[PDB]
Each structure stands twice: as structure tokens, then as C-alpha cells.
From TrEMBL:
Disulfide bonds join 20-153, 35-45, 86-166, 338-416, 440-550, 454-462, 458-591, 466-589, 600-676, 612-620, 674-771, 718-749, 779-925, 790-819, 807-810, 872-945, 970-1038, 984-993, 997-1066, 1088-1116, 1172-1259, 1173-1369, 1284-1372, 1298-1301, 1305-1395, 1359-1370. The chain holds residues 32 to 1953 of 2799 of the full protein. This is Erythrocyte membrane protein 1. Residues 37-185, 297-430, 808-946, 1105-1252 form the Duffy-antigen binding domain. It comes from the Eukaryota. GO terms for cellular component: membrane. Residues 962-1080 form the Duffy-binding-like domain. GO terms for molecular function: host cell surface receptor binding. Signal peptide: none annotated.
Amino acid sequence: SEVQYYGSGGDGYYLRKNICKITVNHSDSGTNDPCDVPPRRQRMCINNVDKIRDKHAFLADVLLTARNEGERIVQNHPDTNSSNVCNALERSFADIADIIRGTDLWKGTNSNLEQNLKQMFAKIRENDKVLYRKLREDWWNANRQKVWEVITCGARSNDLELCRKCGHYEEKVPTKLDYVPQFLRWLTEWIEDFYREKQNLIDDMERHREECTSYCSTCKDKCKKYCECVKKWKSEWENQKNKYTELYQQNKTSRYDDYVKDFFKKLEAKNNKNWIWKKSSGKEGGLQKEYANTIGLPPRTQSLCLVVLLKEWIIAAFHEGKNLKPSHEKKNDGKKLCKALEYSFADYGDLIKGTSIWDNEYTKDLELNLQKIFGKLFSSLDELRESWWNTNKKYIWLAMKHGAGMNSTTGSGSSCDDIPTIDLIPQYLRFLQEWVEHFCKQRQEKVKPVIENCKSCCKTECKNKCEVYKKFIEDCKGGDGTAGSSWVKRWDQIYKRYSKYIEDAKRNRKAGTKNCCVQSDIDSFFKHLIDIGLTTPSSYLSIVLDDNICGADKAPWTTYTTYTTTNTAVVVNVPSPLGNTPHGYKYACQCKIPTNEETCDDRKEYMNQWSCKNDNYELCKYNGVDVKPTTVRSNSSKLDDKDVTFFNLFEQWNKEIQYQIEQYMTNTNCKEKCKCYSLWIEKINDQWDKQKDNYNKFQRKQIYDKVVSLSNFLFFSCWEEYIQKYFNGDWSKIKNIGSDTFEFLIKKCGNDSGDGETIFSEKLNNAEKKCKENESTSCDCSEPIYIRGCQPKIYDGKIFGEKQWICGACIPPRTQNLCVGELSLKQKIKNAIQKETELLYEYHDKGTAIISRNPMKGQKNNDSNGLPKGFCHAVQRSFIDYKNMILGTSVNIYEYIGKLQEDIKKIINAWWKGIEGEMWDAVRCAITKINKKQKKNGTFSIDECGIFPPTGNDEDQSVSWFKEWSEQFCIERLQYEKNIRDACTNDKIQGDCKRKCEEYKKYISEKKQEWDKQKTKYENKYVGKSASDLLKENYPECISANFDFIFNDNIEYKTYYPYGDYSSICSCEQVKYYEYNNAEKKNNKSLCHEKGNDRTWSKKYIKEGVYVPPRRQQLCLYELFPIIIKNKNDITNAKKELLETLQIVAEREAYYLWKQYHAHNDTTYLAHKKACCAIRGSFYDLEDIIKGNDLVHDEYTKYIDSKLNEIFDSSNKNDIETKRARTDWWENEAPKTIRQLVWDAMQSGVRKAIDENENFPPCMGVQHIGIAKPQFIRWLEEWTNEFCEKYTKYFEDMKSNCIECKKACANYTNWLNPKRIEWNGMSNYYNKIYRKSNKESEDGKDYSMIMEPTVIDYLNKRCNGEINGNYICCSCKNIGENSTSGTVNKKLQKKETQCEDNKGPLDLMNKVLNKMDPKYSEHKM
């Protein structure tokens, strides 16, 4: 039952949990009808053959009909009593059951349903293999068991065994058995209805008569009408009795008829509570069935006075309140009594409103009495109770505080709070606060003795109470509460229940709050909490509590702490108040030394997860993974034994330490930082010494029975790391390497010989000096007359013939001309540089229209010191050019200047440094003279643009010229963008816009060629870094530009977007998405590349321990970018263009994704499901990008997010409110929403991919899907699925091919080497925010729905089955040994020695090839 998945209705497999949450698109029905003296003749339900596959779909259809009828009758409520609601519900339940081939007594076209059901059972093969009416009895039993829990999930008033629902919802058995004949069931329904009508109408008539004061004539007329209808009812009853006698004489369906005749024959013939935490039974106190194993009841609620005309009822409430006052007066005898009154006030409110969550033995009778009283005295009953509570809580609160004389409405009997005392909170949170307050009281009384005799001053005086506090929390004893169970289990139950309410409020109600404020229901309060960010219980407790009632040390509720001690030891991670010791009292009540090594260990600062008198070997085992024997260790026919494990451990140790050194020296209170950094430096140095000793012992053992040395192995590792990072295929030939790349490889880590030990030594020295440096942190000459030799330079302007880029790497124009007319040389060069500097300053002052983003006036951008813009950079590059001129470094210049360089070298390096310092002093003196003759506004020589000189490690010739090129390109692009937007904003292009766009297109074409040459040269020189990131950080001019799109090298870029990021502005057309039903002119205009599997994971472009998947780095963000930069501060018209682009982008992404996973080789159920999940993941990524909850900031996504903020309200509106507005825009329309439109566009692309002669898949018929999880979680799931799939592929390939085992081991080792670090990063990030939220996590994202102890337990229960393709799409067969699978301890035992025996010769030849490469490089000259 309900096992069918992906049904013809459109959706499936959502059932088996939250079963009554069924829409029309779940059964294989012909028509999706919502089902909008027979009393049900008008419309009961009309939903109910050749299309149905199995009986499960028909059962789902009947489940849908019952749910629709249940919702319809609940929302209708024809009767105003609201007490006998479920009686009509079960009557409709019996009626719908009788429709399925029963006593169909409805006059009319009753044969249509009968014939349809007959063909239905015919298709089901009622004449089954096992012998005919067994199907009807079996399905009726299945019907009676199943649909009762679905139809009854709407109404929750009462049912007269279980209550608080129409029978039950989780009891799993029916309450009442309605085996009565439908012929007389209608008679029983009507006569029962007429009884209640008679008692109501006679009372209404009496009320009208006494309220009146010629109404006597009306009274008589009603009396005769009542007599007339009573006579009709008696006559009808007599006729029905005559029919009964006729049928009885006639006697004198098999089972149903026999039962009916059998029934016809029978008719003819107080105490202190202890915080009860258990579920509520029939007649015992306890939490409700929906509240089973939830927050318990305090003693106050169970010992209330209630447990022990409108004017009459309100006086009764006053008397109840007045009696309740002495109960709290004697039970509590200041602040303790006031809170008790407030909770009792709120508990009374929820009891009156009908939202009690405890339901004692007398609660059901009291609720029924309240329903009858308000039914007799007075939209909806629940709204009436809420209105009564709001308008009478004013007097009830005063009544409870010594209510004897009710005045019209401090000095009264209490001074708790004001008159209203607003406490409109759900009862679950109030019970949670009361339990936490009671726990805080117990914690404070236990912690007070500890602090008083453990104040850093211990043999036995302090540890005894520390053990008592540890014993008090670590069991179900010592403190009151939790109902005889550990505190951690109840806290976990509270966290699970709070998360469930957060999920239910977030998904069940699309828009609950902001309907008028809040709607004052259960979902609105949780919606408000989610908006605030208090989605975790710890955040809620911290904000609401005073933070001082417990601990006496300001112990936060958000600082989670974990303890291992509890025969078996289980790690328990809980908040700070739930701890074995007080906050900061870990290893402190023992009164020991600070232990700074472990002191920084608990802080998670520079963690090193390594644990390195014969002294044969050292373990150096990794934490968590346990060292095991090789299992193939042999002494005969084996080169080595018990050394492969050390080799793998040393290799993994080397990789992790190198990654840690790179991350710690490139990334980064400072005194304690470098203390722990110094401890880490000492630790790795000890590890390196131990590894050196073991590797030496390994070498001697190998020589005893030719292995490569430590330097040879380290040189191979750098080469291998380089190949995997960039080559990514481990190609045999490596001759295709540039000279710049080869020099970088020979200079970075390894020289021609092997110097790996020097590599580690220099890395340690570099780390130490960075640690040391981080912790540690006259001129009077005047010769103005001598000005002759050079003239103003040929600048790129016309004021009254401009130097062009002659483009080795490139040659800028200003470098081509310098004030070098003179070219003993010290004075000449000093005068030349000074003359050039003042001349450059003069042109930048007046000619400030080339490299300064400002008008002809300028200086209104401008430097903070008041100097001209773009003056520091030009001066610095001029000095760099002069430095390389005199020094003679690598320069891309022809023979014009080479003669001068040879002359300078022939005429003549501490002297050069002294010369450079002299020129710096001369430039400083010249700048001061310029300041002197410029009225001496302020004192400044070199602090304008940084006191220190340019000492970049990178070459200052090619990089600086590349910086100059991009700055000129970026400034000119902004000017051209301004000119276009001022001249082409007001349709076709025939005026002053074609010339501007055409000039821009030529300009982009020229700079594209220069960009390709410069980018290629930079990549050959610097392969580790990129070009776009360098330009963006140095120059904030072109934050809006993207070199990938503007200088895109594809062939379709010159057709669909030929104008380079301003096609939309220069075209002035309108975009549109041609759907499947639209015109034949489909939207096949895109720059999407064909997806490839060669791409790998990388952590670049992320604002730690998170890696971007290959799928996310290949999504099409090309079509959005011209439209994004088109609109600026425009939300009205940009809504249409953004939506149309998103549909086009989503359609293309699904089309290419399906072609990737079905590229003529994988046409199977698993391939379809994998493509289905990839399309879903892309949809979630697009949703998170639009919602602004994205982690990675690429070139496209960064500006898309920035412009999305700008398109919405400006800085007056808060960024969080802008984020909410974007979320609301994506969710709702402000026909269908953008979420469904994008999903339908993705479906339409899949139809095109399928039609390119295949059937449609099953896992794309889902009209709606569940809300996305956090982004990191989906990336982790994709990583696990790819890890398990690739692991299975390589292992099965290795087992069969192990005479080709060398290749299998090589691919296995190369693929598994980075995955271990990726697993460590993923696991560290998962543990960091495992149960965090917006105000607890480092990022403002919701993670309260995870609630997992560790990442390995989370992969369980999600990747432990088949590829469903809708919710779960990961499968694995190594769920247990996941951390060990990253290593090679257990899963690679049988093929352990073979891989090293193959890798040894591989290492030897690779080092031999890498040794001969520099020899061929040197011999080529």
C-alpha cells in the first residue's frame, strides 16, 4: 500500500510519512478533480481505469478522495455547534466506503461508478491465481485500516477510545466500527439531527419570546408547523417500519447481507508532581500523543484549581482565579511568585483557547464542558474563544491577584506585572523556559560550592564537589526533572521537537506572518523566530534568559562543549550549561598547571592530527585511523616487508604538512597566536626529524636486500602535485612545458638535483619569519635652473600622434618615451629622474583625462592627500623601468635600447642598492620641492602612497605593465559605458549609437588579442595564481567587468553577443523565453559549453573547509551578465528580463546536463536518476544564488549578487531586509510562481533532450519538489556519491587487472590523494556548524535542521540505499570504513605491496626524466 513511486498523477514516494499531505497529482486518475432524503446529494466527492498500473494507485486515489472530503467538510462546518464535527466525518467515511461496490442507494446515474469499479477489479484480476470475493474483503480491511488516519488529520475538535482528534491519528486501529445499513443510516442521521434542532429551536423561540418584551400569531403558526412536520416524521417512520416488515416477510452481497440480517434479528429480538515526561494514556497524566517524549509538565500545571449567561461564566472564572491565588500563595510563600502567576495565566489562556498540550484525565471533560457552554451562550469557535480570552484576560489577571471586589479597571495583593501582562507565547516554549529555569536553579546551587572552594587555590577540598557536579549531570539522579533520564537525552528530544516545529512552520505555511503583524497562531510565532534567526533552542534560551541565573561565570547557551567520559565511552556534545564541569572549569577543578599545549588544543588553533630502547620504528599514526598490519607481509619473493604502511603514512604526512604550511603562511591576541604557532613549529620539526630517521632506516633495509632517497621522493611529490593540479591526467610526455613554467618549477621547490629537505627547511624558515614579523608588529640641494634635454612626452591625447601599444609580453606607450635626453652617470640619472617626475606631475595636474576617472576639470576621483589621481602608479613604474634599465634584467625590448644596456653594463651588487636608495632620496627631495612650490599646504614626501618601497617578490616589469594595461582598459571601458548610457538610453539603432557601439567592438577586439597574449604569458610565468583576481583586488575601478565574458574565446560569442557585455544596451530589443507551446522560433541562443567530466573540485572563489563541485563551476552564467549590467536601480522592468533569462539559463543547463549523463553510453535507470538529481542540484544552486545564500563568489556570481542588492532598495533599507525581499520575490510572484516557471523550463529542456527518439524519464514528472537543504549539505552529498561511485569503479577495475596493475594503482593513488584532505575539510566544517544557526554559525545560514552528532553518522540513513532520484540520490557500499577508506589501511590490504612495487619504478623513471629535463634545457642554448 502506497508503495508506487513516480505515478501518472505526477508525484510519488512522498507518502509513508505525513500521509494526508496529498495533492491531486499523486494518483493515476483520468481527471484531477479536487472534489469541490440524501443530505449529501449536492457534492460528496467526484474523483473516481485502463491507465492505472496496480492497486496501489487506486488506493492512493481513494486516499486522495477521503482527504479532499475531509478537508471540505472541516472547512465548511454547516452546523455552528462545532462539537459534533467528527460524527459527520465518520458518516462520510462510511458513505465513501459503501460506494466501492456496496449498497449504492443514491438515485440517478449510480451505475457509472459501479461499472467503473467493475472494470477496475477486472483489471486487478479479481479472479486471481489463488481462489473471488476475497479481493473485496481484503481491500475493505485495507481501506478501514488506512484511510481513517488520512481523513481525520484535518479536524481536531473531539470525538466521543481516544480524543483530541476524530478518533485518532497515530493509534493505528479504528475507533468505532460503523457496520450499519446505509438504508437506515440516513434515517438515524436525520432523526438525530432533528432532535438537536428541536432542542435548539425551542430554546431560540423562548429566547425570542422573552426578548420581544402581534407576535402571538407567529408563535401559533410555528406551533402548527412543528405539529405538521412531526406528523410527517411519524408517517415516514410508520412507512419505513412497513418497509422493514415487508423485507422481513420477504426473507422468510454475502458477508454484508448476512451481517445486516443478523443485526435485524437482534433488533427484533494533592501530591507533589515529579515532572511527568511520558505520553498520556487513557486515564493517566502525561504528554499528548503528538507531544510524546517532549517537554514535560511542572508541578504547577498539574496542581491547578481547575484540576481540583456570559456574566455568570465570567464570575465563575473570577472565582476560579480567586481560589487559585491561595494555592500559589502557599506553594511559593518576590520574583519566584510573579513568574508562577505569569505561567499560570498563560496556561489558563491556552486551556480556554483550546490549545492545551498536556490533556490530563479531567481536561477532556473540561474542554467538552467549555464547548457546550460557549455553544449554549454563543466565523469559527476557535476565533470566538481567542476573542473572549483577549477581552477578558484584563479582568481575569486582576481577579487572580486577590480578586474580591471587581472594580471598573502596586497597592493590590501582588505587584507582579502590569494589567495586561502580555505572554502570548506557545505553551511548548513556556514549558521549555520553566524547565531550563529549574535546571538553572539546580546548576547554580551546585556550582556555588564549586566556585567558593575551587578559586584557583587541590588534593581533596575541591575535587569532591567537582565529582558531585559531574555525578549530578551524568545520570538520572541528583536533580529533579527529566523524569528519571539523562539530561542529554531530554535536550536532544527538545532540539528535535523544536527543529520539527521550525520545519513545519517554514514549509507548511508559505506565508503565515505579516497578515493584518502576526496571525497569533502557532506557526506565526515560529515564523517570527525564523526571521529573527533564533531557529536553535540555545539561541532562544540565551536571548530570553537573563544569562546570570546559572553558572555564575556567564556560561553561554550557544557555546557547545563535548565530553567523552560517561564500560563503553560515548562522546556527548551538548551546550555549555550541560557539561561535566562549569564553563572554563575543564581541567581546572583538578587544580593542575595551565598546560598551554593542550590549552591551545581545545581552542582548535593550528590543529596537527599526528601522534609521531631499541627504537626500531615510529608509528606516526593519524588520529581516528588505527594502524593495522599490511596483511601481505612476506619475507620470500618480496622486495620489502612492513614498510609500505610507513611509506603511505609518510606520504600522507608530507602532503598534509605542506598544505598546512601553505595555508598558514598565506592566510595568517597575537602573542598567544604565535606562542601556539611556535609550539606547532616545534611539533612539525620533531615530526620531520622522526620521519627522517625512519626514512633512513627504510633506505638501509631496502639496500640490505636501491630505493629513491628522501630528496628524490620529495622532488617527485612536487612534480606529481603539479601534474595532478594542472595536467590532471598524469600524461607520460611532459615536453609541452614553457620556459617560464619550467623556470617556475625548477625554482619553486626542486632544482635539477634533489633538494626536498631544503624545501622543507625553507618553508619552516618562511613560516617562522612570518610568525616573528607578525608578532613584532636630509636634502638641501637646489638646481632648478638646469632644465634641458627632454620635452613633454607624446601622451594619448589631443590638446593642441599618440604612442600605441607595441604588442614578448607587451610594451606600454609611456615606457617608449622617457626624459633620457642625456643618454658621472649618477648626476645625469638623478637629474633625468627628477625632470621626468616633475614633468609627469605637471601633465597629471593639467592633462588629467587619460588615466583618471573624472571630467575635464577633475579633482572633485582624487587621492586623500590631494595629489593627482594615477600619479603614484606611473611614478613607481617609471622608477621600476629605470631600475631595470640600469640593472639590465629581463626586458621585452628590441635592439634600440639593447645598445644602451650594453653600454651601461660595460661602463661599470651592493653599489646598485646604494644607487637605488640615492634615487629614492632624490625623488623624495623632488616631491618635497613640488610641495614647497605648491604653497606648502602640508608636509608629505612618501607617505602619500605608502612609506615602504615596492618590494614585491613577483617580477615588477611584466606584472606592472600588465597592471597598467588593465587599468587603462578598465578606465576606458567605464568612460565608453558612460558615453553609451548617456547617448543610447532613449526601436532600432540608426542614430548616434551605432558609431559608439562599433568603436567599442573594435576596442574590445584589440584588447582581446592583447588580453590573450598577456594572459598566456602570465600563466606560463605564474601558473598558481590567476589574472582576474589580481586586477580586481588592486584596482577597484572595474569591479563590474569580467574578462571571461568580455574576452570570451568561443565561436558563438561573436554571433549572439557580438558587442562584448553591452549587446543588450546596443540592441535595445526585448528578451523572451519561447516555451514548448510557443512559436517554432525556439530560444537556442546561449553560450553554454558542452559539459565535461574532466573538471575537479577546488576551493577557489569562496569567501573554510568547503569545496565547490565540478557541476557548479560549469553552470551557464553568460546570458544573465549582459542583462544584469544593463539594469541599475530598476526593479520594475528588470523583473521580466531577469525571469526570462533564468528560464533560458535553467532550460539550457538541464539540456546539457542530460546530454552529459546520457552521452550515447549510459541509457539506463541509474543514468536517468543521476541526471535527475544533478538537475535538482543545479536548481537549488540557482535558487540559492537568487536568494543570496550562496557561498562561492565567482566572477559572475559576485557581481550578480552585488547588482541584485542594488536593484532592490538602497542603503536606507537593511541588507537582511533586502535578502528577505529577494527570497519573497523568488518564492511568490511578487498563474504560477518563478519557482515553478523555472522548474517547467527545466522540464521543457529535458523534453528537447529526450526528443533529440527516446521516452521521457520518470524522475522529471514531479510538478513540485521539496525545499532545498543547506548548500554545503548538498555538496557533501554529491562528494560522497562521486567518491563511492569512483571508488567502486577503480576497485573493480583494479581487481580484474591485477597484467596492468601499475596503471590501476597509479590512478587509484592519484585520485585518493586529494580526497583525504577534502574529507578532512568537509568533516571539520560539518562538526563546526553541526547544530548552528544564523546567530551561532559564522555565516547567516540556517543549519538547525541538520542535528547530527558527526558527518559519518549523517552519511548513514541518506546514502544507505538505492538512487531514488527525488530526495536521496547517493549510494555507497563503504558506509562504515569511510575515514579508513581515505587512507590505505584496511580497504587496500590485499593489493598493498603490489602498488608500491609498481610505484617504485614509476618514481625512479619520473625522477630520472625530471633530472634530464634541466640538462636538455641548459644544452639547448
